[PDB]
Paper text:
The most predominant and clinically important multidrug efflux system in [name] is the CmeABC (Campylobacter multidrug efflux) pump, a tripartite system that includes an inner membrane transporter ([name]), a periplasmic fusion protein (CmeA), and an outer membrane channel protein (CmeC). A recently identified [name] variant, termed resistance enhancing [name] (RE-[name]), can increase its multidrug efflux pump activity, likely by influencing antimicrobial recognition and extrusion. The cryo-EM images of RE-[name] without a bound ligand permitted us to resolve the structure of apo-RE-[name] at a nominal resolution of 3.08 Å. This multidrug efflux pump adopts the overall architecture of RND-type proteins and forms a homotrimer. Each protomer is folded into a transmembrane domain containing 12 transmembrane helices (TM1 to TM12) and a periplasmic domain that can be divided into six subdomains (PN1, PN2, PC1, PC2, DN, and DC).
We also incubated a 20 μM RE-[name]-nanodisc sample with 1 mM Ery for 2 h on ice to form the RE-[name]-Ery complex and determined this structure using single-particle cryo-EM. The reconstituted sample led to a cryo-EM map at a nominal resolution of 3.39 Å, thereby allowing us to obtain a structural model of RE-[name]-Ery. As with RE-[name]-Cip, the three RE-[name] protomers of the RE-[name]-Ery complex exhibit the “access”, “binding”, and “extrusion” conformations, respectively. Again, Ery was only seen to bind within the “binding” protomer of RE-[name], whereas no Ery molecules were observed in the “access” and “extrusion” protomers. In the “binding” protomer of RE-[name]-Ery, Ery binds at a site that is distinct from, but partially overlaps with, the Cip binding site. Our cryo-EM structure of RE-[name]-Ery shows that the bound Ery molecule spans both the proximal and distal drug-binding sites. The oxacyclotetradecanyl ring of Ery is mostly housed within the distal drug-binding pocket, leaving its two hexopyranosyl rings to occupy the proximal drug-binding site. The amino acids within 4 Å of bound Ery include K89, I136, I178, I291, M570, I572, F610, L612, F613, T614, S615, F625, L662, and P663. Most of these 14 residues are hydrophobic in nature, underscoring that drug recognition is mainly governed by hydrophobic interactions. In addition to aromatic and hydrophobic residues, it was observed that some charged and polar residues, such as K89, T614, and S615, are involved in Ery binding.
Numbering used by the authors:
A (entry chain C): 546 to 941
B (entry chain C): 249 to 495
C (entry chain B): 100 to 297
D (entry chain C): 51 to 198
E (entry chain A): 100 to 149
F (entry chain B): 744 to 792
The structure:
């Protein structure tokens, strides 16, 4: 039984083993703010280079979407490859991943993320924690980014956890419209009208519906793409000044280049920047949870509030009913065996029978190199049941 | 022809003069390509309380029927189909059941050295598996990969129960020459009746706490544990009642 | 109780249209509360360095939202209702002097203190494709009182702007000064919790 | 439509998040506000009936629909039970490239999807694309200035 | 019927984007109904003065 | 409603949340019964009534 403890300690613990799902998810991310046509050229080259290898049969792409963060960022495209078959293909999914990774490290023009599809849907992986740094002071997301980055820089040194990533990004370029209200009121304009003109020309303005094939379809107003592509597209836009005079839009408006976050995130009615991380090897998920909580408390104090989601929230709010139920089951088994044998002492033999089955299972799983799994525990359940059944008959 | 303004002349300024009108998409941010060819993916979420295999087959046939009427150059494909995984798992569970039954017949023909005895597992095991299916359906559980894995597990419980009952009958039959088959069976059943109930209750009490565990891992555990408990209880009842008579 | 609430909301949905614009703008809340106070929680500042309005705003931002997530709490509210709100205290003597009415103030605040929609610069369909796609971000909702007093109601015949500061006094005050919560001899916002039905 | 991420967050997510707060058995709330769109996922406690969660969310959002801006009110908020997995994905492609993506999407939406809804067991049928036929008026600023 | 109305309302909620704007402005109402006519009550003025 | 009562025009951003903007006259002017003698409303013409 001491060797059982040793073998349990040495064996790795993971939630679900990685399995080839017969397709390979490719995540392509161009630099932030890259145009869609560049992404289409990239994914065209991607599929062309993936065509040579015989293992993939077909390629499905979804240009203009980010699978990681549901969105329509034009700089991100997801291209799922379809493996030929499990039987007709000599290579496993991992070797295909390695070949595609090796083809694509050199160019560094289109970032490559080749990941096998999740065994089961909505499955948290490696028991990572989902921290939300709810800013409570109302600071700008740009300052939130620097504070959170200081938090990660502190957290990287911590031994409990490793591989921390933050979804919040502010690299995306964003023109900032600075409105000189004095000039716009001077020209006898209204902010609502000038912004309707902007939304009509640069943006898409949706006015009414027109029917085709019996279905009610939108009517959209936008300026020709030739004119709005340039940064100084305001000067061609003209707005009436309520005095029957054409006032140029660039007179009171100006585009200045700035960097802003493409996607914002609010957790529990409060602005936040989601932080993910995985426990370091040899450390439990909960230990990493308190470690990152302490890091957040040190870095951010009384201005950011910690939050938990998914697996981290389940661990934080866990009532520990599983261990209590296991203790109840152990007591019930003891009682039922004592009733069967008409003696309190003898069920001890039936209980001590199961360590042999547990020892065999853990020894073989250690030798095989397979890590502790959910399916391993499911098999251990039947193992304990059968060992107990054999012992009960021997004792009786 | 929408009239933006009316000039001093009878001629009217219209949208055609200042803008170009065409039927375009609402959004140009996205685009889908399959094999370097323009495509539109379609997603089909399975309705709750339905059969995946039948729905997938109906979808494929309906797609073929619609493809008969497709415009020239339009072709369909189904890259992802979770029905493949469940069909493979069902085939593998059937093969595992057949192999386990054949191995039971072989092992009992080897040790027990009797041919008429092989029939007893052949009836006892399928009855208990069918009962497990029925009680699983009553509880509302659904066939899935986890359930099929737990069925692979429960195969061992059922075959083992049949082995214990039949082997005890044979051992008592060979202990005494004077004893009759019915008397040997009743003696063995008297010996191991309360033990079998004890194993059934013990295994249920072992499996129950696993179901109480919360979380996604808790629910995954609950599936295996609950079908395992259902199977062991029904197999115990079958070995208690049907197996001795056939023995 | 849940089914009763769902039926009540289903029947109410039709009548919401006939309600006045202000009523629906504030919104109609349908809950399962019994309107019987389950308990009263009073948050009081011992050091008295925190004013009643700021205590109420702290509570409504931090405590009340978390309390409403607690199961079994049908509705939780604070007596004061002294939420943060820009108060434009108009002076009628100064309003009639400059010849601007309260309607001219409402229109100015509605038009200027708002955020509208601005499209991205480089977007398809474009025949001259730019290397990058740039979004446009604006801020039309003023944050500080100094920005609110600079709102231009009217432009004089010369290049002189009449502004809210001339005709009104702007400050950050409570939404309502109607109520007050007192604990013992101290000032504390009381949190009344109504038990959810069943 | 055509609103940057921050304004969408502040103007749309905040009222909806305020109104949705306090819904029965809600563990936490996650919302993202990408350019032009605002998705708000409202997670609930395990064992809660999904239809019940959906209808309560509907009621809470219908309470605060009026506070939303004019464009968001025009394009009403959609509430769905996101707890769904993908049975399969059917891709309709024009091999000869006779039709562009817009025509393919419109044909699929008008013809293919309705038959998919007819297939028993197909609870949800959707198309990834977002290209509905729309009447586009391409304004030319030079011509607009020429005609005043 | 209580859950049937819930399912119908949830589906209309999910498809709200597909609806035309007018029926979005005038909220669509989902209510349980019964085709059965339990009885017909007729109110009449005996004096015919009403 | 903008002078005697409180008129809620729209919301301003503060501390992440949205807080109302309310317009009202000073407490002194709406205090008396004869409050109406002080408020003036402009007609279709430029005259103040
Ligand atoms: C949107 C449109 C997409 O739907 C999703 O976003 C779903 C709901 C993802 O979960 C959503 C879940 C969500 C919303 O959770 C907050 C978010 O994380 C993203 C969008 O994935 C799932 C499971 C993806 O796994 C996800 O792949 C991502 C690259 C990373 C993500 N995880 C590591 C983070 C992982 O789970 C997965 C199985 O590959 C997608 C498969 C079904 C597809 O190929 C299909 C075509 C999708 O692209 C999609 C229907 O177009």
């Amino acid at each position: 039984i001491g060797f059982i403890a040793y073998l349990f300690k040495i064996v790795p613990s993971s939630l679900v083993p990685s399995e080839d799902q017969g397709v390979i998810m490719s995540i392509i991310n161009l630099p932030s703010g890259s145009s869609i046509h560049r992404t289409i050229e990239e994914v065209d080259t991607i599929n062309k280079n993936a065509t040579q290898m015989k293992e993939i049969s077909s390629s499905v792409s979804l240009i203009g979407f980010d699978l990681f963060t549901s969105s329509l960022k034009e700089n991100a495209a997801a291209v799922f490859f379809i493996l030929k078959d499990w039987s007709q293909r000599e290579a496993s999914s991992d070797q295909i991943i390695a070949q595609l990774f090796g083809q694509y490290a050199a160019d560094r023009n289109a970032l490559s993320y080749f990941l096998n599809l999740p065994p089961i849907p909505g499955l948290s992986l490696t028991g990572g924690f989902e921290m939300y740094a709810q800013n409570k002071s109302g600071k700008d997301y740009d300052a939130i980014q620097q504070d959170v980055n200081k938090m990660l820089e502190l957290a990287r040194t911590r031994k409990e956890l490793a591989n921390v990533r933050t979804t919040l990004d502010t690299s995306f370029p964003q023109y900032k419209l600075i409105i000189d209200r004095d000039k716009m009121k001077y020209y006898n304009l209204n902010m609502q009208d000038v912004f309707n003109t902007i939304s009509a020309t640069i943006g898409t303005y949706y006015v009414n519906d027109f029917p085709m094939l019996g279905k009610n379809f939108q009517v959209n107003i936008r300026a020709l793409g030739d004119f709005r592509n340039t940064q100084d597209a305001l000067k061609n836009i003209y707005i009436r000044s309520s005095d029957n005079k054409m006032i140029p839009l660039n007179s009171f408006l100006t585009l200045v280049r700035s960097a802003g976050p493409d996607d914002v995130k609010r957790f529990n009615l409060f602005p936040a920047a989601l932080i993910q991380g995985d426990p370091a090897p040899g450390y439990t998920s909960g230990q990493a949870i308190d470690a990152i909580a302490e890091v957040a408390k040190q870095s951010l104090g009384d201005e950011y509030s910690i939050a938990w989601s998914g697996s981290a929230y389940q661990e934080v709010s866990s009532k520990g009913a599983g261990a209590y139920a296991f203790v109840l089951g152990m007591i019930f088994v003891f009682l039922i065996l004592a009733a069967q044998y008409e003696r309190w002492l003898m069920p001890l033999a039936v209980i001590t029978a199961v360590p042999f089955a547990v020892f065999g299972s853990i020894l073989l799983v250690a030798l095989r190199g397979f890590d502790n799994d959910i399916y391993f525990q499911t098999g251990l359940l039947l193992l304990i049941g059968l060992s107990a059944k054999n012992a009960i008959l021997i004792i009786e | 022809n929408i009239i933006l303004r009316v000039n001093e002349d009878k001629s009217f300024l219209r949208i055609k003069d200042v803008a170009k009108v065409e039927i375009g998409a609402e959004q140009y941010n996205s685009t889908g390509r399959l094999n370097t060819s323009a495509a539109v993916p379609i997603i089909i979420n399975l309705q709750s309380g339905a059969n995946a295999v039948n729905t997938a087959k109906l979808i494929n046939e309906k797609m073929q029927e619609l493809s008969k009427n497709f415009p020239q150059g339009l072709k369909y494909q189904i890259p992802y189909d979770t029905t493949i995984f469940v069909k493979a798992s069902i085939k593998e569970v059937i093969k595992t059941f057949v192999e386990a039954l054949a191995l039971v017949l072989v092992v009992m023909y080897l040790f027990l050295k009797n041919f008429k005895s092989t029939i007893i597992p052949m009836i006892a095991v399928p009855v208990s598996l069918l009962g497990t299916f029925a009680v699983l359906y009553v509880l509302g559980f659904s066939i899935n990969l986890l359930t099929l894995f737990a069925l692979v597990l429960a195969i061992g419980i059922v075959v083992d129960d049949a082995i214990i009952v039949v082997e005890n009958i044979d051992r008592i039959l060979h202990e005494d020459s004077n004893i009759s088959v019915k008397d040997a069976a009743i003696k063995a059943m008297n010996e191991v009746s309360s033990p079998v109930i004890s194993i059934v209750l013990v295994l249920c009490a072992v499996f129950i706490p696993v179901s109480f565990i919360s979380g996604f891992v808790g629910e995954i555990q609950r599936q295996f544990a609950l079908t395992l408990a259902i199977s062991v209880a029904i197999s115990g009842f079958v070995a208690l009642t049907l197996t001795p008579s056939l023995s | 109780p849940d089914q009763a609430a769902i039926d009540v909301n289903n029947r109410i949905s039709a009548a919401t249209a006939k309600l006045p614009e202000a009523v629906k703008k504030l919104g109609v809340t349908v809950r399962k509360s019994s309107s019987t106070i389950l308990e009263v929680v009073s948050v009081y500042s011992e050091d008295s360095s925190m004013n009643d309005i700021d205590i109420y705003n702290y509570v409504s931002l931090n405590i009340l939202d978390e309390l409403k997530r607690i199961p079994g709490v049908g509705d939780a509210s604070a007596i004061g209702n002294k939420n943060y709100s820009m108060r434009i205290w108009l002076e009628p003597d100064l309003l009639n002097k400059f010849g601007v009415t309260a309607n001219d103030v409402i229109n100015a605040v509605n038009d200027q203190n708002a955020q509208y929609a601005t499209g991205k610069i480089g977007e398809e369909p474009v025949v001259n494709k730019s290397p990058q796609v740039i979004s446009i971000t604006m801020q039309g909702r003023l944050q500080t009182p100094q920005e609110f007093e600079n709102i231009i109601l009217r432009v004089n015949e010369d290049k002189s702007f009449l502004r809210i500061k001339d005709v009104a006094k702007v400050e950050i005050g409570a939404e309502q000064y109607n109520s007050t919560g007192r604990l013992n001899t101290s000032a504390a916002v009381p949190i009344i919790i109504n038990l959810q039905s069943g | 439509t055509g609103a940057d991420a921050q304004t969408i967050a502040s103007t749309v997510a905040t009222p909806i998040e305020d109104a949705i707060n306090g819904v029965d058995n809600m563990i936490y709330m996650d919302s993202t506000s990408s350019p032009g769109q605002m998705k708000l996922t409202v997670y609930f406690n395990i064992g809660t009936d999904p239809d019940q969660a959906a209808i309560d969310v509907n009621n809470r959002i219908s309470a605060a629909t009026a506070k939303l801006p004019e464009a968001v009110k025009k394009l009403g908020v959609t509430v769905r039970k996101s707890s769904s997995t993908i049975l399969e994905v059917v891709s309709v492609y024009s091999e000869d490239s006779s039709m562009n993506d817009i025509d393919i999407y419109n044909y699929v939406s008008l013809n293919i999807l309705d038959e998919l809804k007819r297939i028993p067991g197909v609870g949800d049928a959707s198309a990834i694309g977002n290209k509905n036929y729309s009447m586009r008026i391409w304004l030319e600023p030079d011509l607009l200035n020429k005609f005043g």
